[PDB]
């Protein structure tokens, strides 16, 4: 792994994780976001909190992290510590009392095209209104609002990977049945700023 060591050394020798990975500051970073639901840990009707084990797949292209595969023996992909690269700051807007952002900085899969794939694990304690009138025969529509906290849509654009959460790895819950799920992108505008 001399080639991969040299590649990692030369990529990050003067990399900046502060500025966005665009070629021109007027361009928008496009992040593909995909929620994967691994396990419904708990639903709390009293505090109105739903605890879920999830994965946030995030994909974007970093302009500075390209390389030529022939220069480095044909290495087409590498895994790197995600603390080094620039990352979107997705925050669970409706967090009740858990961690707002990702705290498990797993490795990033980086490809010679600059395409970054990151799938950190998270436990989301989302806050949602619980309707108890039909208990125990009730149904609950609970939600997870994800968005970049400090970046706006003119600077970083997020797009859903698929219209539904990935339930292929979902552990069967012994207490709730997920009848349906979907993800909607929303784009609000405020009266200060049409831009």
């Amino acid at each position: 792994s001399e080639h991969e060591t040299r590649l990692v050394a030369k990529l990050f020798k003067d990399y900046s994780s502060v500025v966005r990975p665009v070629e021109d500051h007027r361009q928008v970073v496009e992040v593909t976001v995909g929620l994967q639901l691994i396990q419904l840990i708990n639903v709390d009707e009293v505090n109105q909190i739903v605890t879920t084990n999830v994965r946030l797949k995030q994909q974007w292209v970093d302009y500075n992290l390209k390389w030529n595969p022939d220069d480095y023996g044909g290495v087409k992909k590498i895994h790197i510590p995600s603390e080094k690269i620039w990352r979107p700051d997705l925050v669970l807007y409706n967090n009740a009392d858990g961690d707002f952002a990702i705290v498990k900085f797993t490795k990033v899969l980086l490809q010679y095209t600059g395409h970054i794939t990151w799938t950190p694990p998270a436990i989301f304690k989302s806050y949602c209104e619980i309707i108890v009138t039909h208990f125990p025969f009730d149904e609950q529509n609970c939600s997870m609002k994800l968005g970049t906290w400090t970046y706006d849509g003119s600077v970083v654009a997020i797009n859903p990977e698929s219209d539904q959460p990935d339930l292929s790895n979902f552990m069967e819950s012994g207490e709730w049945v997920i009848k349906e799920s979907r993800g909607w992108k929303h784009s609000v505008t405020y009266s200060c700023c049409p831009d």
Partner: peptide
Amino acid sequence: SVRPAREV
């Protein structure tokens, strides 16, 4: 940070 593959 680099896995010890000898060949690529």
